Enzyme design. Structure first.
Site, PDB file in Angstrom:
ATOM      1  N   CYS A 168      30.667  38.183  31.903  1.00  0.00           N
ATOM      2  CA  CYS A 168      31.712  37.851  30.746  1.00  0.00           C
ATOM      3  C   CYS A 168      31.143  38.575  29.551  1.00  0.00           C
ATOM      4  CB  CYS A 168      31.680  36.546  30.404  1.00  0.00           C
ATOM      5  SG  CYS A 168      32.811  36.158  29.146  1.00  0.00           S
ATOM      6  N   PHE A 181      18.882  38.761  37.434  1.00  0.00           N
ATOM      7  CA  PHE A 181      18.529  40.311  37.405  1.00  0.00           C
ATOM      8  C   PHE A 181      20.058  40.977  37.907  1.00  0.00           C
ATOM      9  CE2 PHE A 181      17.559  44.073  39.557  1.00  0.00           C
ATOM     10  CZ  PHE A 181      16.387  44.434  38.780  1.00  0.00           C
ATOM     11  N   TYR A 184      44.632  41.397  37.086  1.00  0.00           N
ATOM     12  CA  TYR A 184      44.469  41.252  35.450  1.00  0.00           C
ATOM     13  C   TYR A 184      43.644  42.333  35.013  1.00  0.00           C
ATOM     14  CZ  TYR A 184      40.147  38.349  35.649  1.00  0.00           C
ATOM     15  OH  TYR A 184      38.955  37.888  35.533  1.00  0.00           O
ATOM     16  N   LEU A 232      45.012  45.850  35.032  1.00  0.00           N
ATOM     17  CA  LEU A 232      46.276  46.161  33.943  1.00  0.00           C
ATOM     18  C   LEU A 232      45.645  45.981  32.489  1.00  0.00           C
ATOM     19  CD1 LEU A 232      49.245  43.855  35.604  1.00  0.00           C
ATOM     20  CD2 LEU A 232      48.376  46.515  35.974  1.00  0.00           C
ATOM     21  N   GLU A 233      44.761  45.042  32.282  1.00  0.00           N
ATOM     22  CA  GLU A 233      44.165  44.882  31.009  1.00  0.00           C
ATOM     23  C   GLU A 233      43.427  46.129  30.676  1.00  0.00           C
ATOM     24  OE1 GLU A 233      41.324  41.517  31.349  1.00  0.00           O
ATOM     25  OE2 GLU A 233      43.181  40.259  30.788  1.00  0.00           O
ATOM     26  N   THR A 293      25.446  33.042  40.990  1.00  0.00           N
ATOM     27  CA  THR A 293      25.288  34.484  40.900  1.00  0.00           C
ATOM     28  C   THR A 293      26.301  35.437  40.821  1.00  0.00           C
ATOM     29  OG1 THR A 293      25.633  34.509  43.550  1.00  0.00           O
ATOM     30  CG2 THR A 293      23.427  34.196  42.668  1.00  0.00           C
ATOM     31  N   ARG A 302      48.950  48.865  45.283  1.00  0.00           N
ATOM     32  CA  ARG A 302      49.207  48.790  46.594  1.00  0.00           C
ATOM     33  C   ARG A 302      50.154  48.109  47.147  1.00  0.00           C
ATOM     34  NH1 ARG A 302      44.345  48.187  47.965  1.00  0.00           N
ATOM     35  NH2 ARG A 302      43.524  48.762  49.934  1.00  0.00           N
ATOM     36  N   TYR A 333      15.205  39.108  40.707  1.00  0.00           N
ATOM     37  CA  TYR A 333      16.391  38.840  41.750  1.00  0.00           C
ATOM     38  C   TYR A 333      15.672  37.828  42.683  1.00  0.00           C
ATOM     39  CZ  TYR A 333      20.167  39.972  44.935  1.00  0.00           C
ATOM     40  OH  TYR A 333      21.100  39.798  45.674  1.00  0.00           O
ATOM     41  N   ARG A 353      34.393  45.345  43.751  1.00  0.00           N
ATOM     42  CA  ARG A 353      34.470  46.010  45.132  1.00  0.00           C
ATOM     43  C   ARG A 353      35.018  47.649  45.293  1.00  0.00           C
ATOM     44  NH1 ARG A 353      38.978  42.597  47.611  1.00  0.00           N
ATOM     45  NH2 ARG A 353      37.234  41.234  47.254  1.00  0.00           N
ATOM     46  N   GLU A 412      56.571  28.198  17.944  1.00  0.00           N
ATOM     47  CA  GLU A 412      57.723  26.910  17.940  1.00  0.00           C
ATOM     48  C   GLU A 412      58.874  27.284  18.835  1.00  0.00           C
ATOM     49  OE1 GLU A 412      59.965  27.199  14.421  1.00  0.00           O
ATOM     50  OE2 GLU A 412      59.481  29.302  13.928  1.00  0.00           O
ATOM     51  N   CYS A 428      34.780  39.604  29.808  1.00  0.00           N
ATOM     52  CA  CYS A 428      35.950  38.998  28.772  1.00  0.00           C
ATOM     53  C   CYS A 428      35.464  39.578  27.420  1.00  0.00           C
ATOM     54  CB  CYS A 428      35.504  37.470  28.650  1.00  0.00           C
ATOM     55  SG  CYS A 428      34.702  36.716  29.906  1.00  0.00           S
ATOM     56  N   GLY A 488      49.320  36.026  42.933  1.00  0.00           N
ATOM     57  CA  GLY A 488      48.817  34.677  42.437  1.00  0.00           C
ATOM     58  C   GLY A 488      49.315  34.304  41.045  1.00  0.00           C
ATOM     59  N   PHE A 489      49.847  35.095  40.027  1.00  0.00           N
ATOM     60  CA  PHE A 489      50.469  34.679  39.044  1.00  0.00           C
ATOM     61  C   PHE A 489      51.906  34.747  39.340  1.00  0.00           C
ATOM     62  CE2 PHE A 489      47.034  34.818  35.822  1.00  0.00           C
ATOM     63  CZ  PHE A 489      46.230  35.454  36.557  1.00  0.00           C
ATOM     64  N   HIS A 540      57.034  26.802  11.520  1.00  0.00           N
ATOM     65  CA  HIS A 540      57.963  27.814  11.206  1.00  0.00           C
ATOM     66  C   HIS A 540      57.293  28.540  10.040  1.00  0.00           C
ATOM     67  CE1 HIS A 540      61.671  30.367  11.157  1.00  0.00           C
ATOM     68  NE2 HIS A 540      61.490  30.202   9.941  1.00  0.00           N
ATOM     69  N   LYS A 589      35.982  43.791  27.011  1.00  0.00           N
ATOM     70  CA  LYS A 589      37.557  43.701  27.434  1.00  0.00           C
ATOM     71  C   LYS A 589      38.306  43.389  26.120  1.00  0.00           C
ATOM     72  CE  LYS A 589      39.842  40.352  28.566  1.00  0.00           C
ATOM     73  NZ  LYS A 589      40.017  39.719  30.027  1.00  0.00           N
TER      74      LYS A 589
END
Ligand SMILES: Cc1cc2nc3c(=O)[nH]c(=O)nc-3n(C[C@H](O)[C@H](O)[C@H](O)COP(=O)(O)OP(=O)(O)OC[C@H]3O[C@@H](n4cnc5c(N)ncnc54)[C@H](O)[C@@H]3O)c2cc1C
Ligand SMILES: Cc1cc2nc3c(=O)[nH]c(=O)nc-3n(C[C@H](O)[C@H](O)[C@H](O)COP(=O)(O)OP(=O)(O)OC[C@H]3O[C@@H](n4cnc5c(N)ncnc54)[C@H](O)[C@@H]3O)c2cc1C
Ligand SMILES: O=S([O-])[O-]
Ligand SMILES: O=S([O-])[O-]
Ligand SMILES: O=S([O-])[O-]
Lengths: 485, 484
Positions: free
Chosen positions: B50, B34, B191, B194-195, B152, B212, B122, B157, B468, B55, B218-219, B463, B58
Site C-alpha cells: 500500500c 523483504f 480496479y 482502470l485506476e 506476506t 478480456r 525473507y 501476475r 445530500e 494506495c 465482482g462489483f 446543502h 496511486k
C-alpha cells in the site's frame, strides 16, 4: 369558495418545495414571491435566499478560492504552471450569475409544469383567508385561500449607525457586486461572515474581520477557535471586541474608500481604519412584520420576529402554517425548509402523519478549512449529561493530497462525543478538513440510527480518505494522550 | 522457550499493525520484511504494497490528474490562466517517492520506538516453531517463536506469454518509473487497471485498455459500466474481448516502442498495435508458495494460493495465524488488514474477544469518476433476497462545483438497495461522483447500525454537497420513473 386551496407567501427553498409537493395532490396552489431591494438597489429572481444570495453563490465563490489553492498544489504534482496567476472578480461573478439565472428560469418552468400559479408580487394579509398582492408597479389584487403557508425568510440586519446603509454592503449585494471589493472589512462573526471573509482572502484580497465577542456563537467553541486560528495563519486579520460606530465615505468609486470608526465593547477605546468595501454580516431579521399578521391573528415572538409553530408547522391560527428560517427555535437551513415543506404538503393532502425531525441535523461551515458537524457540541453535551459521563475521542489528521504540496500538517481535526451513561452513544460529531460536508452526511445518518462508539470502531475505514480517521479514534481528552500525527 | 513471543512474516499493512499492537502488551516481537524485486529490478522499502506501490502513490497520481482538471475548471471561476499547461512525469514521481521515503522511515522509527525487532530478510518456515531468515547477501539465520503471523501479501501476475516479463511493467514498477510512460496499453480490467489508466489519461497520455471479458468483476456491473463509459468519453480507448499473445520490442528506449499482438477471446481474430509502455494489471498472486508452509503443516487452497483461517485468523495450525490479502474469501484492503492485525494482537495478548467484522466493508475505486460502495451489489442483493423483495432507489446528480465549468451533468449517480422483507433495510450503497470515498465512509457506519430507508429519509441533507442526494431518493427502478 376560495380562489386557492393553498397560497404560499415566499418562493424560496421552503415555499417552492411545498408548492411542488402540494401540486402532486391535484391542489390549486399559488406562490407569491417578491424581492424587496437592498438599500443600494440590488434585487434578484425566483428561488429565495439560497439560490440567489446564499448557499449557491457562496459555495461557488468558495470553490473559486479552493481552485486558487489547487493552482499552487498542482506544481508539486508536476503541472508546469506559470508563477503568478491573478484572479478576475468580474469573470467569476458573471459565471456565478449565469448559473443563478438558469436556476431562476428552472424554478419558473417547474412551477408552470406543476400547474402552480406564480405571481411576482408582495403578499400581505388583510383579513381572515385573504391576502393582498402588490406587484412592482403598485397594482394590488386580493386573493383568498383555504390555507396559507408563510415562508418569507429573512434579510440581513444593519447596525443602526451612520453610513451603514449608505456605504456598506451585505451578503445580498456581495454576490452580484459589479466590481472587485478590494480591501475589505467584514463585520461580524457568524458563519456567513467567516465564510465570506475566507473566500475573499482565498481570491487574493486583503481581508479583516471585526468581531463583537466570539466566533460562531452556538457552535462548538474549540472548533470555532481552530477555524479562526487557521484563517489568521492564512493572512486574515481579526479585530477583537470592537463594533463599528460610523462609516464615512472618503472617496466615492467602484470601489471607493471608506473610513470606519469603531468602539471597544468593554472599554471606551476607539479606532479608525480605512477600507474599500465594508461587508456587514451581523445577523438576519425575519420577514414577519410587514405581512399583516395582525389582521389574521397570527402570533409571533415580538422581540425576535420568529414564528412559533406546532410540531406540524401550524401557527396559532389553524389554517395558517409556517416553515423555514422564520420559525422559532428551529434551524435556518435550506434542506430543513425543504423537508418541512414537503412533509407538510404530505400531511395536509396525502394522509401522511410523518413530521419533520429537527434533531441531529448536520451542517457544514465553508470556511477555508471546512467544518462539518452533527449533534451536540462538547460544551452542550457536558451540560446535558455531565462532565463525568462524557468521553471525547479525537485526533488530528493530514489529508494525503496535502503531503506532496507539503502544507498544513496538524490542522485537520476530528472528534466524537460519547455518552458513557448510554453505551457510549455518539451524541456529537465534528470534523475540520476538506470536503467536511461530504464526510459529515453519512455520519449524520448513522446518528439517526443510534451509532455507538463500539459500532463506529467495528466499521472499517476506506483508505486513503480523510473520513477513515473516524473509524480508529482511540485517544480521549480525559486520557491526556498526545494527538499530533 | 523461544526467541520471540511472535514472529511476523511480512512488514506491510497487516504485519506492521499487528506488531505495533502486540508490542503494547510487552511482548517480544520480530517483523521480517523483504521485497523481492520485480523482474526488471524494482524494489522498495518497509511498509508493504500500500505504502510503496499501492494506495498511497496511486491516490497521489490520481490527485495529479484531478489537479489537471482543476486547472481547466479554474478559468471559469476567474483565474487568468494560460491555455496550455504541460505535465512533467519526473517531477510528479519525484514528489511521490519523496513522500513514500518519509513513510519507509516513519515505519522503521515506529518499530524501533515500540521495541519490535525489524529484520530485512525473507522468511521461510523450516520446522515446527522455526523459521529461516535469508538476507540480501544470502546469509541465513534461524529463529524460533511461540506464535507466528503470516502477512506476506501478494504480487502482480504476468500472462505467461513471450515478452511479458522482459518488456512490460506492472503496478510495482509504475510508481517509480524513471521516465514518462508515453502511449500506453493497460491490459486488464480490475480496479488497478482502470485506476492506472484513468490517471495516466488525466495527465495527458494516450491510453488504451484491453479487456478480456467485463469491467470490475465482482462489483455492481451497472456501476462498472458507467465508470467505463465515462472513461471512454474522456478519450480512453477500450479494446473489448482480447488478450495479448506476445509483446515484441521494436526499439529499446525510455520509453521504447513495443509491438503488441493480441487474440480475440471468442474468435480467431488477431490484432496488432504499438505502444511505448505496456502495463499489465491482470491480477495478483498470494505470496504463500515459497515460505515453507509444508514444513509446518499449514494448509492452503492449492488452486488460488489463499489461506483459509478461522474467524480469529487462525490457520489449521494452532500457533500460526494469518491476515491480509492472502486470506481466503475476505477482502484485499489495507484497513481490513490493519483492523485484523490489531484485533488479533488484542485477542492473543489483551484478553479481548472482539473479532474483525468483514461484513459491509466499504470500498472506493479511484477512477476519473470515483466509485464508492458498501454492502451488496444490485445483482447480489437480488440473488440473495429475490427480485420481488428488492427496491432500488436512484438518481443522477450534478455537483455544484461542475456547474460553472459547465461540464458533466447527468454522470454522477447514486443508488441504495433496499430489502422489502426487512423494513427496507439498506443492504447496498453506491455512489459515482467526486470524493466518493468521503461520502461512503459514514454511510458504511450507518449500515453497521442497520439503516433503513425510513431512517435515511428522516436524515436531513447538508446543502450544497453531493452526498445530500442520499437523503431525498424517491424514485425507484421498479417505478420506471425518469431520473435525468
Ligand atoms: C450568505 C448565506 C449563506 C447560506 N448558506 C447556507 C448553506 O450553506 N446551507 C444551508 O443549508 N443554508 C444556508 N443558508 C440559509 C438558507 O439560505 C436559508 O436557510 C433558506 O433560504 C431559507 O429558506 P426559506 O424558505 O425559509 O426562505 P428564503 O429562501 O429566504 O425565501 C423567502 C422568499 O420569500 C420572499 N418574500 C419575503 N417576504 C415576502 C412577501 N411578503 N411576499 C412575497 N415574497 C416574500 C423572499 O424575497 C424570498 O424570495 C444561507 C443563508 C445565507 C444568507
Ligand atoms: C495498485 C494497487 C492499489 C491499491 N489500492 C488500494 C486502495 O486504494 N485502498 C486499499 O485499501 N487497498 C489498496 N490496495 C491493496 C492494499 O495495498 C493491500 O490490501 C494491502 O497492502 C495488503 O496488506 P498486507 O499486509 O496483506 O500485505 P502487503 O502490504 O502486500 O505486505 C506484504 C509484505 O510482506 C513482504 N513479503 C512477502 N513475502 C515475504 C517473506 N516470505 N518474508 C518476508 N517478507 C515478505 C512483501 O514484500 C510486503 O512487504 C492496492 C493494491 C494495489 C496493488
Ligand atoms: O488601502 S486604501 O485604498 O483603502
Ligand atoms: O404557539 S405554538 O408554541 O403551540
Ligand atoms: O509439520 S507436519 O510435517 O508435523
Amino acid at each position: 369558495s376560495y380562489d386557492f386551496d393553498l397560497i404560499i407567501i415566499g418562493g424560496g427553498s421552503g415555499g417552492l418545495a411545498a408548492a411542488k409537493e402540494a401540486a402532486k395532490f391535484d391542489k390549486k396552489v399559488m406562490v407569491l414571491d417578491f424581492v424587496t431591494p437592498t438599500p443600494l438597489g440590488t434585487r434578484w429572481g425566483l428561488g429565495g435566499t439560497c439560490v440567489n444570495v446564499g448557499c449557491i453563490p457562496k459555495k461557488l465563490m468558495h470553490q473559486a478560492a479552493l481552485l486558487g489553492q489547487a493552482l499552487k498544489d498542482s506544481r508539486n504534482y508536476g503541472w508546469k504552471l506559470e508563477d503568478t496567476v491573478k484572479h478576475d472578480w468580474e469573470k467569476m461573478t458573471e459565471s456565478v450569475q449565469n448559473h443563478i439565472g438558469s436556476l431562476n428560469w428552472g424554478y419558473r418552468v417547474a412551477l408552470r409544469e406543476k400547474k402552480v400559479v406564480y405571481e411576482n408580487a408582495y403578499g400581505k394579509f388583510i383579513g381572515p383567508h385573504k391576502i393582498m398582492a402588490t406587484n412592482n408597479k403598485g397594482k394590488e389584487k386580493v386573493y383568498s385561500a383555504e390555507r396559507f403557508l408563510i415562508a418569507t425568510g429573512e434579510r440581513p440586519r444593519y447596525l443602526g449607525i451612520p453610513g451603514d446603509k449608505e456605504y456598506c454592503i451585505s451578503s445580498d449585494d456581495l454576490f452580484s457586486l459589479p466590481y472587485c471589493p478590494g480591501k475589505t472589512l467584514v463585520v461580524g462573526a457568524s458563519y456567513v461572515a467567516l465564510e465570506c471573509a475566507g473566500f475573499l482572502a482565498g481570491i487574493g484580497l486583503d481581508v479583516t474581520v471585526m468581531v463583537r465577542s466570539i466566533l460562531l456563537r452556538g457552535f462548538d467553541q474549540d472548533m470555532a477557535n481552530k477555524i479562526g486560528e487557521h484563517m489568521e495563519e492564512h493572512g486574515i486579520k481579526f479585530i477583537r471586541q470592537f463594533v463599528p460606530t460610523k462609516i464615512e465615505q472618503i472617496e466615492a468609486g467602484t470601489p471607493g474608500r471608506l473610513k470606519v470608526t469603531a468602539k471597544s465593547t468593554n472599554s471606551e477605546e476607539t479606532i479608525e481604519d480605512e477600507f474599500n468595501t465594508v461587508l456587514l454580516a451581523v445577523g438576519r431579521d425575519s420577514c414577519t412584520r410587514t405581512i399583516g399578521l395582525e389582521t389574521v391573528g397570527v402570533k409571533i415572538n415580538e422581540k425576535t420576529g420568529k414564528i412559533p409553530v406546532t410540531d406540524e408547522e401550524q401557527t396559532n391560527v389553524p389554517y395558517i402554517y409556517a416553515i423555514g428560517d422564520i420559525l422559532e427555535g428551529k434551524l435556518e437551513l435550506t434542506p430543513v425548509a425543504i423537508q418541512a415543506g414537503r412533509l407538510l404538503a404530505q400531511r395536509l393532502y396525502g394522509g401522511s402523519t410523518v413530521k419533520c425531525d429537527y434533531d441531529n441535523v448536520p451542517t457544514t461551515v465553508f470556511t477555508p478549512l471546512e467544518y462539518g458537524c452533527c449533534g451536540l457540541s462538547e460544551e452542550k453535551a457536558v451540560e446535558k449529561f455531565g462532565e463525568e459521563n462524557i468521553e471525547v475521542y479525537h485526533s488530528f489528521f493530514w489529508p494525503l493530497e496535502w503531503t506532496v504540496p507539503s502544507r498544513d500538517n496538524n490542522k485537520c481535526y476530528a472528534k466524537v462525543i460519547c455518552n458513557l451513561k448510554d453505551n457510549e452513544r455518539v451524541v456529537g460529531f465534528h470534523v475540520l478538513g476538506p470536503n467536511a460536508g461530504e464526510v459529515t452526511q453519512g455520519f449524520a445518518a448513522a446518528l439517526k440510527c443510534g451509532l455507538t462508539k463500539q459500532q463506529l470502531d467495528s466499521t472499517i475505514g476506506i483508505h486513503p480518505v480523510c473520513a477513515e480517521i473516524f473509524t480508529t479514534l482511540s485517544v480521549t481528552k480525559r486520557s491526556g494522550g498526545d494527538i499530533l500525527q
